[PDB]
């Protein structure tokens, strides 16, 4: 073969084979992890079930995450101050102080905001003049009309603790930073020696249309229903029934062409409050066609099967049900059993004996 | 009832723009281009093959040196390739794992990534530390970001899930200008070769042309029946390509402010994913849900080529900066290049 190619190639192809070895090894987390989708309409129900299935963590104050949230708490402070100076600029008449050198000296650090590491004595020394200036708070109360980070006023009063070099913030400041509004609240744990990821939606858009196809090769999808919702008011239309919209969107999931092999797991997470409310508010509001009985323990199963029979033309979708639970260890044990059922089914399918 | 009076005046102004559109219409392009010369039969072979992935492929991007190619996974990887030598030069992980778009720098130093979690990330390659560092972050949008492009090495334009677009500067981490005016969610965008105008396409059958520095809705383009999923720009800076869910890709012109020509092959019901031009301005390269790509002539109004070398649905395609080659990425966990 060739020689002059090999000199530069002992960097090039060495890099390619090394990065190929670094890329192929992801099967340790690619195939060992089994993806679960979460969806429903009971938001507090969702939060309670996800906090119960999560193993109860405390990892906000570790010494390995230290510099990470340090960079976060630095970035938030500089973002907030440049945002409020942008707001002061967008105030149509200038409002500074008598000695206007504070607003001009701010431009030294607005141009000097091109660092990521440790905070300078210069930036602290100029923001201690900026927050001392009463104009920034005169516009900052008015900054609600504009885009504004809500955690602004906390650090800019407590800037002296920030100004100490080599200081470590606490769990409280971290938990003040790490609350996010919209996106994916992707949590994950490992139960019964199997790893599990858990994704969600927080009503990002009006209707789902595009991003559902991104979650294609998902082994399980978990729908949740707070079953004491028939009498609760859908306050976006004259149709009071909150149940029917959730049923319709559930029906749009079950007839989705991307989902013809993905099992569903159905939750009933508000039955205990239903068990007392059934007396005052029975089945006389939800449906006028249940002429069977009045009591809770059979009407619950009836509404379960009346939920279940919307599966259009499929005997390959294994709809699994549950009820509420106080100690959710058996609950997560049940969902463990369900997911291992569907994966052993998939395993014997791939083996070719069913 | 002043809202009804102003929407009456809105209706009559829509009547005025359609009056001006019918008035400035004299003769369509087809009868003027009845006497043009046909090209004939043009075949493309897959030159080199790229098979370094696991999950599906959502987006790719050519450089501005015809040397490097960028491509996004869906398993939390992001890989760049050399074009000629076909070696995996760099491949980075990221903290999220639901990405939907990339953009490479016109210089060749910055690479941008983003996706479902409403945050954009920019990375730096040319460092003294000998490894890629997580460099900069963009956050502020509500909905997921659709597509992003570089117009500079400092200023980045992007398109959100809240029916908006925005111009940011990477040193601040604050958006410079916000572009509101769309009604449906924006899906794709592209900018002019002169870096002065960009056009956004939503799911609401309308295309908005924006001047980058003014921040006013300069031009609107109605006519469609459904979502726009593909935008490409003409190399002169006068025309603009579209695409929709039933292969009804329509040509527009920004100077004359009017529809040019709709395209429709009689055996196609499938959707569009992304469209691309050539250096000539006589070629439209596009892909459909039946795995098929085909070159459509701009002036002749019809050709049904075949280069359907994908088992799964085609996802993204592009033309090179010099127009030498073209690149195709689909959900087969592969990446192919035609010439």
């Amino acid at each position, epitope marked *: 073969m060739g020689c002059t190619l090999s000199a530069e190639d002992k960097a090039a192809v060495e890099r390619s084979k090394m990065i190929d070895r670094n890329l192929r090894e992801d099967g340790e987390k690619a195939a060992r992890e089994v993806k679960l989708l979460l969806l429903g309409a009971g938001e507090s129900g969702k939060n309670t079930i996800v906090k119960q299935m999560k193993i109860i963590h405390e990892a906000g104050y570790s010494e390995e995450e230290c510099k990470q949230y340090k960079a976060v708490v630095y970035s938030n402070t500089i973002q907030s101050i440049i945002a409020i100076i942008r707001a002061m600029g967008r105030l149509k008449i200038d409002f500074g102080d008598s000695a206007r050198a504070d607003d001009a000296r701010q431009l030294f650090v607005l*141009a000097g905001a*091109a660092e990521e590491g440790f905070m300078t004595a210069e930036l602290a020394g100029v923001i201690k003049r900026l927050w001392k200036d009463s104009g920034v708070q005169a516009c900052f109360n008015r900054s609600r009309e504009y885009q504004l980070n809500d955690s602004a006023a906390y650090y800019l009063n407590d800037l002296d603790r920030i100004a100490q070099p080599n200081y470590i913030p606490t769990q409280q400041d971290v938990l003040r930073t790490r609350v996010k509004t919209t996106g994916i609240v992707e949590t994950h744990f490992t139960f019964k020696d199997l790893h599990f990821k858990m994704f969600d939606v927080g009503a990002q858009r009006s209707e789902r249309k595009k991003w559902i196809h991104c979650f294609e090769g998902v082994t399980a999808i978990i729908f949740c229903v707070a079953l004491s919702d028939y009498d609760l008011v859908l306050a976006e239309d004259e149709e009071m029934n909150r149940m029917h919209a959730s049923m319709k969107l559930f029906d749009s999931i079950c007839n989705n062409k991307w989902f013809t092999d993905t099992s569903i797991i159905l939750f009933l997470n508000k039955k205990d409050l239903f068990e007392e409310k059934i007396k005052k508010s029975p089945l006389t509001i939800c449906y006028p066609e249940y002429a069977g009985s009045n009591t809770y323990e059979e009407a619950a199963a009836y509404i379960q099967c009346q939920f279940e029979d919307l599966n259009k033309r499929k005997d390959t979708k294994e709809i699994y049900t549950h009820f509420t639970c106080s100690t959710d260890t058996k609950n997560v044990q049940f969902v463990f059993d369900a997911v291992t059922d569907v994966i052993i089914k998939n395993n014997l399918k791939d083996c070719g004996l069913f | 009832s002043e809202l009804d009076q102003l929407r009456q005046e809105a209706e009559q102004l829509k009547n005025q723009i359609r009056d001006a559109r019918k008035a400035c219409a004299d003769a369509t392009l087809s009868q003027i281009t009845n006497n043009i010369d046909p090209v004939g039969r043009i075949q493309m072979r897959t030159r080199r093959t790229l098979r370094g992935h696991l999950a599906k492929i959502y987006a790719m991007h050519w450089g501005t040196d015809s040397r490097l190619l960028v491509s996004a996974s869906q398993d939390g990887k992001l890989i760049i390739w050399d074009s000629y030598t076909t070696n995996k030069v760099h491949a980075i992980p990221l903290r999220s794992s639901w990405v939907m778009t990339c953009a490479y720098a016109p210089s060749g130093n910055y690479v941008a990534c983003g996706g479902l979690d409403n945050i954009c990330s920019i990375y730096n390659l040319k460092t003294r530390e000998g490894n890629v560092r997580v460099s900069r972050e963009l956050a502020g949008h509500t909905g997921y970001l659709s597509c992003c492009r570089f117009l500079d090495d400092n*200023q980045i334009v992007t398109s959100s899930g809240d029916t908006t677009c925005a111009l940011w500067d990477i040193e601040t981490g604050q958006q410079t200008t916000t572009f509101t005016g769309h009604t449906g969610d924006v899906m794709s965008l592209s900018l002019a070769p002169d870096t002065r105008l960009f056009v956004s396409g939503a799911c609401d059958a309308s295309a908005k042309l924006w001047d980058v520095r003014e921040g006013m809705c300069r031009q609107t383009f109605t006519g469609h029946e459904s979502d726009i999923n593909a935008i490409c720009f003409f190399p002169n800076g006068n025309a603009f390509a579209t695409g929709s869910d039933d292969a009804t890709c329509r040509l527009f012109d920004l100077r004359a402010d009017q529809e040019l020509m709709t395209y429709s092959h009689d055996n196609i019901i499938c959707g569009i994913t992304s469209v691309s031009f050539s250096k000539s301005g006589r070629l439209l390269l596009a892909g459909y849900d039946d795995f098929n790509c085909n070159v459509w002539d701009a002036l002749k109004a019809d050709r049904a080529g075949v280069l359907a070398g994908h088992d799964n649905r085609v996802s993204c395609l592009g033309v090179t900066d010099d127009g030498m080659a073209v690149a195709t990425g689909s959900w087969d966990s592969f990446l192919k290049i035609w010439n």
Partner: antibody
Amino acid sequence: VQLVESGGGLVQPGGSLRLSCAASGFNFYYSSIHWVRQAPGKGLEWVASIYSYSGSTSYADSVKGRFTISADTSKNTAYLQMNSLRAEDTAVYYCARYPWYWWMEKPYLSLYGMDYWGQGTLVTVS
Amino acid sequence: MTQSPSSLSASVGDRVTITCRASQSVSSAVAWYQQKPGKAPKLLIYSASSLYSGVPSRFSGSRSGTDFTLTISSLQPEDFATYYCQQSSSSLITFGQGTKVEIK
């Protein structure tokens, strides 16, 4: 949009003269005016930079303290006076625009550099 | 607060590279200028990245740590002048020594 200058010549070394630079076409208060000299056969050395925002200006690394700058808020014109002469004052002078704060004139992107220049005056000694 | 250029030359139909290294870890306020002999200094690039509107797009400005680079790709023979760098981070304004171009 252009500029203009005046006040070139020669006086015996030690005294001062009036050097004028007029900017035209835009706002005066929403920018800063820079002064720079150039020596025959040499490079470029900075002289002065007056901010209309605060007025807390400064001068060069060596020639500071002995010159005096001014710029009027109405006529939009800068005037410079230069005592304490030496052999290295034989030079062609220029003035230029620098938008420090980019937002007050219009909410815009940033810009770092001298934007618009003149043709420059010339002063010598003997 | 000083810097270091690289004095060099060029020829026609080439791509030329101009380097600049500042003394301290300076921020991203770097400008580039062109000067025809005995004439006005015209700006090329402001903020080390974006070119000025109107100048042809055969020039570009690169930043790498504390190093700055002017890149001219496939010049035209109407470019015979002297180029200059400029630091503008602080309120203390400076320049480079600068270099010129001359063919064989």
